[PDB]
C-alpha cells in the first residue's frame, strides 16, 4: 500500500514471533496480506517458526488461507513440509485447500510424507 513498510515489519515479526508487535502493527492497519519479494506471506514465516498464537491472530486478522509463495507453496504446504501438528490443524479449521498442489505438482500430504511424518499424513487423510 501507500508506503508498504507496515507489511515489511509484519513479515519480520511473523518470522521473529513478537506477538505484541504484530498486535500493534495490525492495530495500526498493517496489511494482513502483504508479502515480501519472494511471495512469502506472514502466514509463511509464522508456519516456519512455529508461532501458533500469531497464526491464530493473523487468521483472526483475515489473512489469505491459500496464499502461495513464488514457489507456489502455501503456508499449508510449509507446515506440511514441517510438521507443526497444531498449526496444521488450525489451518484445516480455517478452510485450507486440500486437493491443490504447488508448482512442484505435489499435494502437501506428500510433503508430510517426505518428512517421514506419519502425523500430518494421517491428519490430512481424514479430510476430503
Amino acid at each position: 500500500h501507500h508506503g508498504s513498510d507496515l507489511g515489511k515489519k509484519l513479515l519480520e515479526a511473523a518470522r521473529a514471533g513478537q506477538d505484541d508487535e504484530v498486535r500493534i502493527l495490525m492495530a495500526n492497519g498493517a496489511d494482513v496480506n502483504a508479502t515480501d519479494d519472494y511471495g512469502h506471506t506472514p502466514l509463511h514465516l509464522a508456519a516456519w517458526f512455529g508461532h501458533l498464537e500469531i497464526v491464530e491472530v493473523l487468521l483472526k486478522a483475515g489473512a489469505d488461507v491459500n496464499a502461495a509463495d513464488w514457489l507456489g507453496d502455501t503456508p499449508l504446504h510449509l507446515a506440511a513440509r514441517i510438521g507443526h501438528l497444531e498449526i496444521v490443524e488450525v489451518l484445516l479449521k480455517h478452510g485450507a485447500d486440500v486437493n491443490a498442489q504447488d508448482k512442484f505438482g505435489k499435494t502437501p500430504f506428500d510433503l508430510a510424507i517426505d518428512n517421514g511424518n506419519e502425523d500430518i499424513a494421517e491428519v490430512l487423510q481424514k479430510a476430503a
Partner: protein, 449 residues
C-alpha cells in the same frame, strides 16, 4: 538508414554466438515482449536422451609453457575452428569452452533419432583433427574425450555473461568420464551403448583401479544501438572490445590477476527430481545467480569481471581491465576489494538463505592469483576467456574446499595476511604438477570448535 539493418546483422551475429539456431530464431521474431524487455524473462526446458561430449587437452601446461602470450590464442582458435567445422558437419551443437576443455551436445533443441551416433563420430573427427594438428604444428599434445547420454535441463542463467547451457547429473557424469577418459580414445558408457548397434571397434573400457566401455575407432537505430552494444558488453568487456574493434583478434598476458571460484555445494542433494523436470529448482538457482550478477553493479565493483558461469559455478576475476598503474591507487588493492566482494557475496547468499524455505544453500570458494593469459576465441562467433597456471590452480583448489570457508593459495595467503585479514591454516594439499601446497581459510572459528 540501412545502418539499422547493419546493426541488426551485428546483433544476429551476437545472438547466434550465445544461443543455438532454434532458440535464436524463436527469439529473433520476438515471441513475447517480456523476453525482449529482459534482453535490453526466459524459458528453460528439460529434454531426455541426449548425447553430451566433453574433450580436454591433455598436458596443456607444457604446451602452454613458454609462449609469447599470442601463439596459444591462435593455435587454440585453429583447433576450435576445425572443431566447429566438424560440429556443423555432424549437426551437433557446441556449448562452451573451459580452458583446456571444449564440448558439445546432440539433439537438445530438437532430438535426432541417431544423435549419439553423430556424437561419437564427431569424437572420431576430433581425434583426426588433433592428430593432424599435432603432426602439422609439431606440438605433441592430444585430447582426452568422454561421452555420455541421458537427460538434461537446458536453458540460460544469469543476466550478466549469461550463456545458453545445460544442467543435470549427466553433466557431472560426462565431466567425470572425461576426467576418467583415456588420452586419444573416447570413454563411453552403456548409456551410449544401449542404442549403439556395435558398429565400431568397441572395447570393455573400464577403470583399472558402471557398464563403461572405450572406443578407439571404426529513428529507432538508437534503440537498436543500445540493445546491440549492451549485448556486446555482455559477451566481451570494453577494453578488449576496442582492441579488437580496430583489429582481428586479441591476446594479453596479465602477470597478476586474482581469480576466485564459488560453487554451490549442497545443491545436488536438493535437486531431487520427483517434480516434472526440476526446472523450478533451477529457476530458484537463476534467482540466486542473477543476484550474484547484480552484485557487480556496485561502483567500487568496477575492476571485477565475471568470466563466465561454469555449470552451476561462478567464475570471477580482476586485475585485467585497468591497465593504468595509478599513482593515486595502490597496485594491490584490487585483490583486497576482490576478497571484499567475496565476503559480500557470502553475505548475499546468507540473505538468500534467510528466504530459502527450510534449506540452506552453502558455497565453497577458492582463491588464487599470479600470471595468466586473456584472450578471445570466436570469430563469426565469440568467446572471452583466460588460461595459464592460475586458472586451473584455483579450479583444483576450490574443488577441494568446504562450504562457507575461503580456501586461499599459500602465496596469496602471504600477500593477504599483510592486508589485515585473519586466517587459520587448513593443511597442505597435493596439487597436480605442483605437489603439496599449503592452504588457508579466512573464517576464524566459525564453527563450534
Amino acid at each position: 538508414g540501412k545502418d539499422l539493418e547493419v546493426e541488426k546483422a551485428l546483433k544476429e551475429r551476437m545472438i547466434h554466438s550465445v544461443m543455438p539456431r532454434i532458440i535464436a530464431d524463436d527469439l529473433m521474431k520476438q515471441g513475447d515482449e517480456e523476453s525482449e524487455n529482459s534482453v535490453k524473462p526466459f524459458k528453460m526446458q528439460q529434454i531426455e536422451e541426449v548425447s553430451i561430449l566433453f574433450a580436454d587437452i591433455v598436458g596443456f601446461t607444457k604446451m602452454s609453457a613458454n609462449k609469447s602470450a599470442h601463439a596459444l590464442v591462435g593455435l587454440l582458435n585453429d583447433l576450435f575452428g576445425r572443431f566447429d567445422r566438424l560440429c556443423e558437419e555432424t549437426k551437433c551443437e557446441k556449448i562452451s569452452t573451459l580452458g583446456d576443455c571444449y564440448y558439445c551436445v546432440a539433439g537438445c533443441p530438437e532430438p535426432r533419432a541417431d544423435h549419439a551416433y553423430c556424437c561419437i563420430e564427431m569424437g572420431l573427427g576430433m581425434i583426426r583433427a588433433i592428430e593432424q594438428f599435432c603432426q602439422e604444428k609439431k606440438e605433441m599434445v592430444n585430447m582426452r574425450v568422454g561421452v555420455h547420454t541421458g537427460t538434461v535441463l537446458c536453458g540460460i542463467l544469469g543476466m550478466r555473461r549469461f550463456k545458453f547451457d545445460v544442467w543435470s547429473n549427466d553433466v557431472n557424469l560426462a565431466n567425470l568420464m572425461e576426467q576418467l577418459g583415456v588420452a586419444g580414445k573416447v570413454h563411453i558408457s552403456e548409456a551410449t551403448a544401449k542404442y549403439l548397434d556395435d558398429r565400431y571397434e568397441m572395447e570393455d573400457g573400464k577403470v583399472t583401479e558402471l557398464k563403461t566401455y572405450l572406443i578407439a575407432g571404426q529513428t529507432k537505430i538508437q534503440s537498436m544501438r543500445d540493445q546491440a552494444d549492451w549485448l556486446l558488453r555482455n559477451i566481451i568487456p570494453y577494453h578488449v572490445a576496442e582492441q579488437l574493434k580496430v583489429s582481428q583478434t586479441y591476446s594479453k598476458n596479465h602477470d597478476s590477476g586474482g581469480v576466485i571460484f564459488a560453487s554451490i555445494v549442497n545443491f545436488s542433494e536438493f535437486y531431487e527430481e520427483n517434480y516434472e523436470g526440476g526446472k523450478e529448482c533451477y529457476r530458484v538457482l537463476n534467482e540466486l545467480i542473477g543476484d550474484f550478477d547484480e552484485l557487480l553493479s556496485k561502483p567500487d565493483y568496477s575492476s571485477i569481471e565475471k568470466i563466465k558461469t561454469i555449470g552451476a559455478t561462478y567464475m570471477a576475476a580482476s586485475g585485467l581491465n585497468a591497465t593504468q598503474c595509478r599513482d593515486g591507487s595502490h597496485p594491490q588493492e584490487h585483490l583486497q576489494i576482490l576478497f571484499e566482494f567475496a565476503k559480500e557475496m557470502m553475505r548475499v547468499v546468507d540473505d538468500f538463505n534467510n528466504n530459502m524455505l527450510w534449506f540452506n544453500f552453502k558455497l565453497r570458494v577458492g582463491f588464487n592469483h599470479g600470471p595468466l593469459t586473456a584472450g578471445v576465441i570466436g570469430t563469426t562467433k565469440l568467446l572471452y576467456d583466460i588460461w595459464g597456471d592460475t586458472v586451473n590452480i584455483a579450479s583444483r583448489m576450490d574443488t577441494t574446499g568446504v562450504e562457507c570457508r575461503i580456501q586461499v593459495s599459500e602465496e596469496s595467503y602471504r600477500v593477504l595476511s599483510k592486508m589485515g585479514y585473519e586466517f587459520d591454516y587448513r593443511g597442505t594439499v597435493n596439487v597436480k604438477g605442483k605437489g603439496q601446497m599449503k592452504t588457508y581459510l579466512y573464517p576464524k572459528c566459525t564453527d563450534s570448535g
